[model samples]
Structures are given as C-alpha cells and as structure tokens.
Target: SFSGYLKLTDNVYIKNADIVEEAKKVKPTVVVNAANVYLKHGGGVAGALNKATNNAMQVESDDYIATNGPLKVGGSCVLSGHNLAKHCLHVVGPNVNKGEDIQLLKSAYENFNQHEVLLAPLLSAGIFGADPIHSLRVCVDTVRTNVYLAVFDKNLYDKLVSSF
Candidate 1:
C-alpha cells in the first residue's frame, strides 16, 4: 500500500483514474495524464503507520555485476543480479523461485523499453555455470519482444531468427 504524508483520504489506491476525476471536481483546471511511468523505489520504501502496507521488498540495481547477473537464460542460474563476463541479461522476478514463465515476463515488462528491448544471457564466474547458448535460448523464449544479443557472443541467433 502507498501512503501520503498528510491524511488526504481514508483510502488510497495506486493509478486510480476515478480519484483523479474527483480531484478535478474541486480544481477544474488540473489535468491527469498517466503513461509509461517510471517509479524509483528503494529496498525499504513502503507504507507508513496507519497507512497502506506492501508485502514485498523492491530491490534496485546496484553496481555493474549485480545489475547483469540473473539475466542468464538456460542452465541452473541463481539470478544474483551480478555481471556475466560475456554478455549480461537481467531478469526481475517477484515469485521467481517457482511459477509460470509469464509472471517473470510481466515482472520484466515494465522495465523494458517500449520501442525496443535488449536481451542476453548472463554467465558469471561461479554462479551460472552459465552456458551462453542455452541461456540465450531461454531469454528468447521467455521474453515476448524483439531481443538482441551482441556478436562477440552469437547466442545461437538461429532459434530466435527463425521463430517468433
């Protein structure tokens, strides 16, 4: 749940268009436009006392390695968010431990660029065992968008080039 510093309302919801309309009822000149919104959340920013509450923790990308680690595809990868030497792929998940692949995609979708998206497999030193080729396949299969993996690492390209 989200909370306002001042007690504005007894109840509050995120991205409620109707609430915006109610606000306009008093101030007719205000306009609300919500779009590709980027919200920067820290690890511990949650609701205040007597306010809304969040059940999960949000982690931000830190350092070079942590940002790129879990992006690895196939193979048994731990997804530590660190760097993979060859090319790095970053995957974000809430129920990451177990669930359908779609949930992972939904978690990552918001972070991806609407115009174009870049994707690759993460192969760090010890974490991933991380096969570049296999990881590439997993990323391509999971992400339902145009993904590009740099050339120094071919990433099998064929499986992706031929299939949707």
Candidate 2:
C-alpha cells in the first residue's frame, strides 16, 4: 500500500538537528542516512522512510541521506549503508519511488554543511541493482544536487557492517 504521502509544507522541513531529535525519539537503532532521496518515479523508498520516520514517535534516523527530485525511473541509484540497524544502526527501510525537488536539496545540503556534529560515515548506497553503471550514472546526473549513499536496513544489519 502507498502509506499515504504527507504534505511538503515548505519543501525542506527537517535538518541535522531534526534528524538527531527524531532519531532519539524513535529510539532508532540506525537511521538510513541519505542526502535527499527524491521522487522522480521508480519508487520513493527514501521518501517513504523519511515520511514514516518523521511522523512516528518511535522512529529515529541514524545518519543516511540521498539527493533531490520528483524521482522518475529512479533516475539515479545511490545506496548508503546497508542493514546498519540493530546494535548501532537500528531502523532500516526505503521510501517509495520519490525524488527531492531543487529547493529541498538545497535545504538538505545546507543542513549538513552547517552542522558541526553530523558525521559522514561512508558511501553505503553504492550498489546498483538496475545495471552495472547505474551507480555511476546517478552520480553524474546528480552533480548539481547533493546526493550521497546513506541507506541502512534494520533486519539486515549484517549485510552492511559485515562487508565493511
């Protein structure tokens, strides 16, 4: 089911502090960090996660983020940390096929760059299930925006940490 998309209010709503606060509230073990997981099409797993996590009181994001857009065909694939949710990273899940808009992307980056405590772990969303060069293509296309690999999974924490 489409868990019902929420209103964008003012495009960019949360920030590093908002994320941290949300993370603490949900008691999240790990939050799949993404820059701005936009929704062009394909599916907005990141957006869904963002919506779900932010709305719920028990959801807390660790530190993962993607880029911006109204996502169309998953334009670009950026995977953050995989399955980093259990002990250290708890929460894990992708939004539907959604992308961030330009305004949202700017907001997200500003939050990260301005934040002194936010940590950039690693480029987790690296694997591309679509094609071999999907990852590369995404990076190239998202040059104007801030799209990083920062996704995590709760049940599959082993998949991410074990590899690293």
Candidate 3:
C-alpha cells in the first residue's frame, strides 16, 4: 500500500514512497536530505524532513555549521535524525543554472556510503529546477549502496514506474 519499485543495476533501486514515512518504518541508517547550502529547512524536502524530526535536525545543523565552518554546494553534513532514524545526511544540490549541475548533483547523492539502508529524495529536480529525467538518470548512475530513492511526487513516481 505504501510503495512501488524499480531496479536498474545490481546496486541501484528505486521506490516510489514517502521518504520520511518509509524511513520511519525502520531505524533508517540514514536519510538523504536535499538540503540547502545553508542547511536551512525552509521548504521542499528539507522543510518536511526537518519538521518531521521536530526541528531537532535544524537545531543540530546550526551547531555543525558554527563549529565545522561552512557547507558548500554539493557538500554535506550529518545530523541527528531524532525519532525518525539514526542520521540525516544533509547534502546540498547546485541549482540547475550552475552549468555543472550534473556533476554536483551526482556528487550529492554519491556523498553517502556508510549506511546499509539509505533513503534519498529527488534532489534538485523540484524547486531547484533540475530536469527530473536527468536527475533520475544521475541517481541511476551514481547510487551504489542499498539506497532506495524514495520518490514522493506523483509525476516523478509515474516516470519512475514507467520509464524502463
């Protein structure tokens, strides 16, 4: 009732499910947050996730930025996942106009490797203006873990389900 599936390579898989809800199913090893460079959870995926964790993610994230210097585009920071999971790997995706969006976006998803089960959102494909099909392809190419790309949008879900 909660998911759909597609498998590309031996290491890549796709799931059409709410990332937060799916992550909550188990103590997810980590959830890939499509975070802003500032790690601000304003809207989009970050907003929902930060709120889901009851703002604990933002609280710890602020401290991380304060102590660890800065988070740049395509860079990452891991914060406490609160009651949802063990960690929230906040990764910044470059805006599509940046010219190098493909590489930087690819780098963002490539950033997490230590988790056995990782849930990722559709990075840069929404408010950030990335091509959904291209972004989906990038995900297909770089994802190597038992990473489930937990897609939430119906358009993305449809594409994921039918674009064999």
Candidate 4:
C-alpha cells in the first residue's frame, strides 16, 4: 500500500497518496497547482484540481491573467480553492524542452509558506513534460515542513521512493 511517507529531512517528506483525495481528506490550508505561464487550468494537475474546486479555479485564473498579466515561468499567483482548500497557490514551472530557463523551476516552487499545511503536486511532471525526478527534487527542496508531496500514481510513487 502506498500509505507511508519517505522523509528527506526532519522537515520534509513525500506523501504516498492522491493529491485531490488528500486535499479533500485533511483539507489543507492550501494546495499547489503546477500551472503554466498563461495560467490555463486545462489539463493535468491544474485541470483536475480546478475540476475539484468546481471550476472556480479556472474563473479566478481568468481574472488573474486579465488583471495582473500572464504569469512568467517561475512566477506564481493565488486564489480561492472554493473550500477544497482555504486557498490555492498556482505556480508556473518551466517547460524545459521549450528552452525556457530550466533553473526557474526552482524559483517557481519557492512560493511556498510553512504557515499552511500545503499539498504540492509534482510540478512540471505533467503537461510541462519536465523530468519527474528533477521536478520531485526541486519541489522537495523548495517547500518547508508541513508540506506533503501528493504523488498520486502508485507506480510513480514507488519509483520516486525507490530512488529517493
């Protein structure tokens, strides 16, 4: 069963579970949506969680981009998660193959705070197509304690844990 955690430090660890399921379970103060520069919540982690929030997420992204401007790679934004969480942090991870700054992935993940018990997805592991292992490393290093790495796939979870 994928139920235990793999501690990387006394302060950080990976949670072997579904991100959305965990969000609904403990209902973290916030969840991290690994979004894009355009903030389009159309697929992957972003799309799933937006659906979980009943599309309030997508609506907020609309306003966010309209008001603030398209988020840059490694930049971040936030909005209500419609009770799925108190709020959602939408950070843009880099698309490595597209030749955007690969190092910016680290910067994008730096938006986390220890104040909230956060559930972070494996950023850049989805539509962005960045290496999942590298994404896992950056995410694990960026967030503070009380953050859970919501690795949803049993196979991916085992793979990550095996090498972790």
* Best-fitting candidate, scored by lDDT: 4
Mind sharing the TM-score for model 2? 0.25
Q: For candidate 1, write residues 1-164 as lDDT tens digits.
A: 11221221222111212222222232222111111011112221111100111311123322323555433222121122112111112333222223324233333433333314332212111121333344434444444544333222223333333332
Residues 1-164, candidate 3: write the lDDT tens digits.
Answer: 22455766676667767777887885677888888877888888888888888888888888887888678787787788787778888888887755545578878767766566677887786777787778778777776677777778877778766775
Residue 8, model 4: lDDT of 68
How high a TM-score does candidate 4 get? 0.89
Q: Quick one: RMSD of model 1?
A: 19.2
Question: Which candidate tops TM-score?
Answer: 4
Which regions of candidate 1 deviate over 4 angstroms? 1-116, 119-127, 151-164
Candidate 4 lDDT over residue span 51-153, tens digit each: 8888888888898889988988887877886767788888888877577777888887787753456678877776687878888788777766566787878
Off by over 4 Å in 3: 1-4, 97-100
Model 1 TM-score on a 0 to 1 scale: 0.25
Clashing pairs in 1: 1-53, 65-82, 65-83, 66-81, 66-82, 69-82, 71-89, 71-90, 72-122, 74-135
Predictions ranked by lDDT, top down? 4, 3, 2, 1
Clash pairs detected, candidate 3: none
lDDT of 4 at 151: 80
Q: Which ten residues in a row have the lowest lDDT in candidate 3?
A: 1-10
- Candidate 2 local lDDT, 82-125, one digit each (tens): 23222222111122223323223322333333222222212213
